Amino acid sequence: SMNAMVVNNLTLQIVQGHIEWQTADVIVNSVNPHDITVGPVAKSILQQAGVEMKSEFLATKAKQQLVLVTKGFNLFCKYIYHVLWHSEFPKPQILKHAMKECLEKCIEQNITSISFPALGTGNMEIKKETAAEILFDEVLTFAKDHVKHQLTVKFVIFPTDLEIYKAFSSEMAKRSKMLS
């Protein structure tokens, strides 16, 4: 099935793999803002990035939002964008607004590649198809509003999350057909 598409200066890719083993300018984490040590993506990123990443997260948080930015530390990225799942807001709203914020931050920081997990999936509030719709909506809106910005956006799906992979790939194929 489809795993990559180009929309003007934006390249969209779906990859089966480990988010924490990516090389990209930015890797996106997904956390409970009060405790970054739980959840499959968060635990993987924290293990790979190392203890100094948690220290910087905590220090930055104490100085203070939907995205908190740290260095990559032992990840092969320059920055980590930590999406903060604040408990008091509806999850679909957080997903949409955090995606928009991440993509704008890419322009702010001269980012050429950003790798996301299957953001917004694996909870009880958002259907996988809904998460895919939201994410693709925001990436395509971004491309329409910032046509000049060259960016590779990759969604990295855990290799055994086959249903999630199918949902993202189906959404890609639909978007590609709409655009052709």
From Swiss-Prot:
Outcome when changing G39E:
Reduces the binding to poly(ADP-ribose) by 50 percent and prevents increase in DTX3L-mediated histone ubiquitination without affecting ubiquitin ADP ribosylation, interaction with DTX3L and STAT1 and DTX3L catalytic activity
Question: Which parts of the sequence belong to the Macro domain?
Answer: 3-176
Q: Where in the cell is it found?
A: Cytoplasm, Cytosol; Nucleus
* Domain of life of the native organism: Eukaryota
PTM note says:
ADP-ribosylated by PARP14.
Gene induction: Up-regulated by IFNG in macrophages and in B-cell lymphoma cell lines. Up-regulated by IFNB1 or viral infection. Down-regulated by IL4 in macrophages.
What does this protein do, in the record's words?
A: ADP-ribosyltransferase which, in association with E3 ligase DTX3L, plays a role in DNA damage repair and in immune responses including interferon-mediated antiviral defenses. Within the complex, enhances DTX3L E3 ligase activity which is further enhanced by PARP9 binding to poly(ADP-ribose). In association with DTX3L and in presence of E1 and E2 enzymes, mediates NAD(+)-dependent mono-ADP-ribosylation of ubiquitin which prevents ubiquitin conjugation to substrates such as histones.
Query: Subunit comment for this entry?
Result: Forms a stable complex with E3 ligase DTX3L; the interaction is required for PARP9 mediated ADP-ribosylation of ubiquitin. Interacts (via PARP catalytic domain) with DTX3L (via N-terminus). Forms a complex with STAT1 and DTX3L independently of IFNB1 or IFNG-mediated STAT1 'Tyr-701' phosphorylation. Forms a complex with STAT1, DTX3L and histone H2B H2BC9/H2BJ; the interaction is likely to induce H2BC9/H2BJ ubiquitination. Interacts (via N-terminus) with STAT1. Interacts with PARP14 in IFNG-stimulated macrophages; the interaction prevents PARP14-mediated STAT1 and STAT6 ADP-riboslylation.
Disease linkage in the record? Overexpressed at significantly higher levels in fatal high-risk diffuse large B-cell lymphomas (DLB-CL) compared to cured low-risk tumors. Overexpression in B-cell lymphoma transfectants may promote malignant B-cell migration. May therefore be involved in promoting B-cell migration and dissemination of high-risk DLB-CL tumors.
The UniProt family comment states: Belongs to the ARTD/PARP family.
What this protein is called in its record is Protein mono-ADP-ribosyltransferase PARP9
Cite the source lineage: Eukaryota, Metazoa, Chordata, Craniata, Vertebrata
